[PDB]
Amino acid sequence: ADPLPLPEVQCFVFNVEYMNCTWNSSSEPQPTNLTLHYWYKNSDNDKVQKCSHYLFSEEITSGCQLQKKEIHLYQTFVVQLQDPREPRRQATQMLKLQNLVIPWAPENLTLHKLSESQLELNWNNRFLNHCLEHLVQYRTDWDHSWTEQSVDYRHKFSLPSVDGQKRYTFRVRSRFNPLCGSAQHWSEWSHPIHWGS
Amino acid sequence: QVQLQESGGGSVQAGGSLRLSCAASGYTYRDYYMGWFRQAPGREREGVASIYTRGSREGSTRYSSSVEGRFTITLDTAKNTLYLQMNSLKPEDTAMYYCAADDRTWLPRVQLGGPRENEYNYWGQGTQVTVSSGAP
Ligand SMILES: *[C@@H]1O[C@H](CO)[C@@H](O[C@@H]2O[C@H](CO)[C@@H](O)[C@H](O)[C@H]2NC(C)=O)[C@H](O)[C@H]1NC(C)=O
Ligand SMILES: *[C@@H]1O[C@H](CO)[C@@H](O)[C@H](O)[C@H]1NC(C)=O
Ligand SMILES: *[C@@H]1O[C@H](CO)[C@@H](O)[C@H](O)[C@H]1NC(C)=O
């Protein structure tokens, strides 16, 4: 009569456009459409919201998608995964969404040569620029590893010691930290840009 | 859509006190964030204070470092009126004070200091506050 363990749901906000809470219900001996419900703490509305867009993986629910109008950043997100055939098998998680925001990868990588010993890299991230920090990796075709540099809300990196006879490669990614949140996972890497020959 | 209208401004000697009021009207059920901004003469507008309306007064307020411990922002949910108690006013507080309200629960917001201007959709017309060292 002991209730079975439930899968753990992983929620992530992607560029404050939507939220994907996903789980893997392939552990069940009998397959079941697990149901998702959610609400917010420090909120006078004591109402439980059912999932509006379930995600399916082989005819069984494998997650839920919340639209932007359903996301309350900076309010504690309580998500409840429940077994419909047995309501006693339920699990609730309390999440802080400001630490689970994942922005898109930086876009529009441009290089601008100011002098023969100074060139700058520029990018934009489809996101409030003052809420993102950035990491710039670069390497030449004669470098064994990468070279990273942290860039703040100013989206400008100046290449130290430019060598015109070497071909460079640049990539940048962003993270929702630390001014507007405390996220730990970075965004995906941007497409690589190149310079020189 | 909310409609804000400030009041309670004036000209006060340095060290005096003041209390602004900003009555909200319209769709006051969906404005989750409210704040106060001020604009000094010839200078850009800056955030003073911010508050989350539906919290339980548990860390739901944020103030600028320039007004911390001197200004307090409150909210009367029954009358739909925002307040900003101002004490120990110095001449640097002379500015045009605006209240603002926002309905975007998903919007990122600065968690250190006064509110940013981009974090609010609806604004009031403003009320003038003038602090002088002598008696005006
Ligand atoms: C969040 O979940 C949605 C829903 O599963 C994902 O959107 C789907 O992405 C696949 C990618 O191959 C498409 O084939 C589907 O048509 C998409 N469906 C919908 C409804 O958008 C989305 O990719 C997920 N986001 C992230 C960042 O993983
Ligand atoms: C889950 O719901 C979908 C919705 O149509 C249905 O097709 C599927 O058979 C259901 N699976 C189970 C195990 O009930
Ligand atoms: C990149 O540039 C294009 C064209 O100017 C623009 O439409 C797009 O919004 C830019 N990217 C971002 C993230 O703003």
PDB file of N, CA and C in Angstrom, chain A residues 16 41-45 68-75 127-128 130-131 176 178-181, chain B residues 32-33 52-58 77 104-113 116 118-119:
ATOM      1  N   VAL A  16      11.908  34.424 -20.658  1.00  0.00           N
ATOM      2  CA  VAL A  16      10.625  34.882 -20.115  1.00  0.00           C
ATOM      3  C   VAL A  16       9.510  34.893 -21.159  1.00  0.00           C
ATOM      4  N   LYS A  41       2.921  31.175  -3.889  1.00  0.00           N
ATOM      5  CA  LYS A  41       2.905  31.602  -2.501  1.00  0.00           C
ATOM      6  C   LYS A  41       2.953  33.126  -2.424  1.00  0.00           C
ATOM      7  N   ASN A  42       2.695  33.648  -1.223  1.00  0.00           N
ATOM      8  CA  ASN A  42       2.610  35.092  -0.997  1.00  0.00           C
ATOM      9  C   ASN A  42       1.622  35.735  -1.966  1.00  0.00           C
ATOM     10  N   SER A  43       0.530  35.023  -2.232  1.00  0.00           N
ATOM     11  CA  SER A  43      -0.499  35.457  -3.166  1.00  0.00           C
ATOM     12  C   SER A  43      -1.858  35.223  -2.527  1.00  0.00           C
ATOM     13  N   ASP A  44      -2.681  36.275  -2.476  1.00  0.00           N
ATOM     14  CA  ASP A  44      -3.978  36.177  -1.816  1.00  0.00           C
ATOM     15  C   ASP A  44      -4.951  35.272  -2.561  1.00  0.00           C
ATOM     16  N   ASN A  45      -4.716  35.013  -3.846  1.00  0.00           N
ATOM     17  CA  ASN A  45      -5.580  34.132  -4.629  1.00  0.00           C
ATOM     18  C   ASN A  45      -5.243  32.688  -4.282  1.00  0.00           C
ATOM     19  N   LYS A  68       3.528  32.933 -20.988  1.00  0.00           N
ATOM     20  CA  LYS A  68       4.120  34.039 -20.240  1.00  0.00           C
ATOM     21  C   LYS A  68       3.132  34.653 -19.256  1.00  0.00           C
ATOM     22  N   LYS A  69       1.850  34.718 -19.618  1.00  0.00           N
ATOM     23  CA  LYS A  69       0.860  35.301 -18.722  1.00  0.00           C
ATOM     24  C   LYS A  69       0.637  34.468 -17.464  1.00  0.00           C
ATOM     25  N   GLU A  70       1.110  33.219 -17.434  1.00  0.00           N
ATOM     26  CA  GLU A  70       0.966  32.342 -16.278  1.00  0.00           C
ATOM     27  C   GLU A  70       2.191  32.334 -15.369  1.00  0.00           C
ATOM     28  N   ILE A  71       3.276  32.997 -15.761  1.00  0.00           N
ATOM     29  CA  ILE A  71       4.535  32.974 -15.023  1.00  0.00           C
ATOM     30  C   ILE A  71       4.587  34.179 -14.094  1.00  0.00           C
ATOM     31  N   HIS A  72       4.778  33.928 -12.800  1.00  0.00           N
ATOM     32  CA  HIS A  72       4.944  34.983 -11.797  1.00  0.00           C
ATOM     33  C   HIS A  72       6.368  34.891 -11.256  1.00  0.00           C
ATOM     34  N   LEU A  73       7.309  35.542 -11.936  1.00  0.00           N
ATOM     35  CA  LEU A  73       8.663  35.627 -11.406  1.00  0.00           C
ATOM     36  C   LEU A  73       8.662  36.350 -10.066  1.00  0.00           C
ATOM     37  N   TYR A  74       9.612  35.966  -9.212  1.00  0.00           N
ATOM     38  CA  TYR A  74       9.847  36.523  -7.881  1.00  0.00           C
ATOM     39  C   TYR A  74       8.762  36.151  -6.882  1.00  0.00           C
ATOM     40  N   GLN A  75       7.755  35.390  -7.293  1.00  0.00           N
ATOM     41  CA  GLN A  75       6.814  34.755  -6.385  1.00  0.00           C
ATOM     42  C   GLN A  75       7.075  33.255  -6.390  1.00  0.00           C
ATOM     43  N   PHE A 127      16.676  40.288 -25.006  1.00  0.00           N
ATOM     44  CA  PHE A 127      16.392  40.235 -23.579  1.00  0.00           C
ATOM     45  C   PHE A 127      16.809  41.573 -22.991  1.00  0.00           C
ATOM     46  N   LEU A 128      16.225  41.916 -21.846  1.00  0.00           N
ATOM     47  CA  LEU A 128      16.646  43.125 -21.148  1.00  0.00           C
ATOM     48  C   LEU A 128      18.136  43.039 -20.848  1.00  0.00           C
ATOM     49  N   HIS A 130      20.211  44.779 -19.103  1.00  0.00           N
ATOM     50  CA  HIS A 130      20.724  44.996 -17.756  1.00  0.00           C
ATOM     51  C   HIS A 130      20.504  43.798 -16.843  1.00  0.00           C
ATOM     52  N   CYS A 131      19.832  42.752 -17.321  1.00  0.00           N
ATOM     53  CA  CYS A 131      19.585  41.553 -16.533  1.00  0.00           C
ATOM     54  C   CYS A 131      20.517  40.405 -16.906  1.00  0.00           C
ATOM     55  N   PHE A 176      21.224  34.768 -16.713  1.00  0.00           N
ATOM     56  CA  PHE A 176      20.323  35.641 -15.960  1.00  0.00           C
ATOM     57  C   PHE A 176      20.847  35.780 -14.529  1.00  0.00           C
ATOM     58  N   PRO A 178      23.726  38.648 -12.054  1.00  0.00           N
ATOM     59  CA  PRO A 178      23.086  38.566 -10.738  1.00  0.00           C
ATOM     60  C   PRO A 178      22.094  39.682 -10.377  1.00  0.00           C
ATOM     61  N   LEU A 179      21.818  40.610 -11.294  1.00  0.00           N
ATOM     62  CA  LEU A 179      21.070  41.808 -10.916  1.00  0.00           C
ATOM     63  C   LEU A 179      19.582  41.514 -10.761  1.00  0.00           C
ATOM     64  N   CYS A 180      19.014  40.744 -11.690  1.00  0.00           N
ATOM     65  CA  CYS A 180      17.587  40.452 -11.708  1.00  0.00           C
ATOM     66  C   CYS A 180      17.271  39.028 -11.272  1.00  0.00           C
ATOM     67  N   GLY A 181      18.285  38.230 -10.977  1.00  0.00           N
ATOM     68  CA  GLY A 181      18.060  36.865 -10.558  1.00  0.00           C
ATOM     69  C   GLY A 181      19.363  36.237 -10.126  1.00  0.00           C
TER      70      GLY A 181
ATOM     71  N   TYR B  32       0.186  44.323 -10.371  1.00  0.00           N
ATOM     72  CA  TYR B  32       0.898  43.563  -9.351  1.00  0.00           C
ATOM     73  C   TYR B  32       2.057  44.331  -8.724  1.00  0.00           C
ATOM     74  N   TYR B  33       2.585  45.353  -9.400  1.00  0.00           N
ATOM     75  CA  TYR B  33       3.717  46.122  -8.900  1.00  0.00           C
ATOM     76  C   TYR B  33       3.428  47.611  -9.001  1.00  0.00           C
ATOM     77  N   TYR B  52       5.349  45.215  -3.926  1.00  0.00           N
ATOM     78  CA  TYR B  52       4.516  44.162  -4.492  1.00  0.00           C
ATOM     79  C   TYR B  52       3.182  44.169  -3.758  1.00  0.00           C
ATOM     80  N   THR B  53       2.087  44.321  -4.507  1.00  0.00           N
ATOM     81  CA  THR B  53       0.808  44.640  -3.881  1.00  0.00           C
ATOM     82  C   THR B  53       0.187  43.442  -3.173  1.00  0.00           C
ATOM     83  N   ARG B  54       0.401  42.234  -3.687  1.00  0.00           N
ATOM     84  CA  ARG B  54      -0.301  41.050  -3.213  1.00  0.00           C
ATOM     85  C   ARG B  54       0.507  40.237  -2.210  1.00  0.00           C
ATOM     86  N   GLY B  55       1.657  40.744  -1.772  1.00  0.00           N
ATOM     87  CA  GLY B  55       2.428  40.090  -0.740  1.00  0.00           C
ATOM     88  C   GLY B  55       1.827  40.300   0.637  1.00  0.00           C
ATOM     89  N   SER B  56       2.488  39.717   1.634  1.00  0.00           N
ATOM     90  CA  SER B  56       2.082  39.844   3.030  1.00  0.00           C
ATOM     91  C   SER B  56       3.045  40.736   3.808  1.00  0.00           C
ATOM     92  N   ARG B  57       3.540  41.789   3.150  1.00  0.00           N
ATOM     93  CA  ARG B  57       4.444  42.767   3.762  1.00  0.00           C
ATOM     94  C   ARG B  57       5.701  42.099   4.315  1.00  0.00           C
ATOM     95  N   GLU B  58       6.179  41.075   3.615  1.00  0.00           N
ATOM     96  CA  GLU B  58       7.367  40.319   4.007  1.00  0.00           C
ATOM     97  C   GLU B  58       8.430  40.547   2.937  1.00  0.00           C
ATOM     98  N   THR B  77      -4.937  48.777   0.084  1.00  0.00           N
ATOM     99  CA  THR B  77      -5.624  47.995  -0.938  1.00  0.00           C
ATOM    100  C   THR B  77      -7.121  48.273  -0.950  1.00  0.00           C
ATOM    101  N   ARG B 104       2.721  43.263 -15.446  1.00  0.00           N
ATOM    102  CA  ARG B 104       3.473  42.186 -16.088  1.00  0.00           C
ATOM    103  C   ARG B 104       4.144  41.345 -15.006  1.00  0.00           C
ATOM    104  N   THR B 105       3.493  40.241 -14.619  1.00  0.00           N
ATOM    105  CA  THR B 105       4.036  39.384 -13.570  1.00  0.00           C
ATOM    106  C   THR B 105       5.267  38.615 -14.027  1.00  0.00           C
ATOM    107  N   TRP B 106       5.499  38.530 -15.333  1.00  0.00           N
ATOM    108  CA  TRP B 106       6.601  37.752 -15.879  1.00  0.00           C
ATOM    109  C   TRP B 106       7.853  38.578 -16.115  1.00  0.00           C
ATOM    110  N   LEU B 107       7.783  39.873 -15.905  1.00  0.00           N
ATOM    111  CA  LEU B 107       8.867  40.751 -16.305  1.00  0.00           C
ATOM    112  C   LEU B 107      10.027  40.636 -15.326  1.00  0.00           C
ATOM    113  N   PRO B 108      11.261  40.510 -15.811  1.00  0.00           N
ATOM    114  CA  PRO B 108      12.417  40.620 -14.917  1.00  0.00           C
ATOM    115  C   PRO B 108      12.473  42.001 -14.290  1.00  0.00           C
ATOM    116  N   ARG B 109      12.984  42.054 -13.064  1.00  0.00           N
ATOM    117  CA  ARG B 109      13.059  43.291 -12.304  1.00  0.00           C
ATOM    118  C   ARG B 109      14.354  43.312 -11.512  1.00  0.00           C
ATOM    119  N   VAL B 110      14.900  44.511 -11.341  1.00  0.00           N
ATOM    120  CA  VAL B 110      16.123  44.667 -10.571  1.00  0.00           C
ATOM    121  C   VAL B 110      15.821  44.361  -9.110  1.00  0.00           C
ATOM    122  N   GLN B 111      16.677  43.555  -8.484  1.00  0.00           N
ATOM    123  CA  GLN B 111      16.482  43.165  -7.095  1.00  0.00           C
ATOM    124  C   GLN B 111      17.423  43.901  -6.149  1.00  0.00           C
ATOM    125  N   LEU B 112      17.974  45.035  -6.580  1.00  0.00           N
ATOM    126  CA  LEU B 112      18.903  45.796  -5.747  1.00  0.00           C
ATOM    127  C   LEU B 112      18.731  47.276  -6.082  1.00  0.00           C
ATOM    128  N   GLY B 113      18.071  48.010  -5.195  1.00  0.00           N
ATOM    129  CA  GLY B 113      17.891  49.439  -5.364  1.00  0.00           C
ATOM    130  C   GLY B 113      16.487  49.803  -5.802  1.00  0.00           C
ATOM    131  N   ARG B 116      13.527  50.324 -11.815  1.00  0.00           N
ATOM    132  CA  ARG B 116      13.870  50.879 -13.109  1.00  0.00           C
ATOM    133  C   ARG B 116      12.618  51.420 -13.792  1.00  0.00           C
ATOM    134  N   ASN B 118      11.700  50.984 -16.906  1.00  0.00           N
ATOM    135  CA  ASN B 118      11.113  50.076 -17.882  1.00  0.00           C
ATOM    136  C   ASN B 118      10.202  49.033 -17.255  1.00  0.00           C
ATOM    137  N   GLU B 119      10.112  48.995 -15.929  1.00  0.00           N
ATOM    138  CA  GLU B 119       9.382  47.961 -15.215  1.00  0.00           C
ATOM    139  C   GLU B 119       7.951  48.362 -14.890  1.00  0.00           C
TER     140      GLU B 119
END
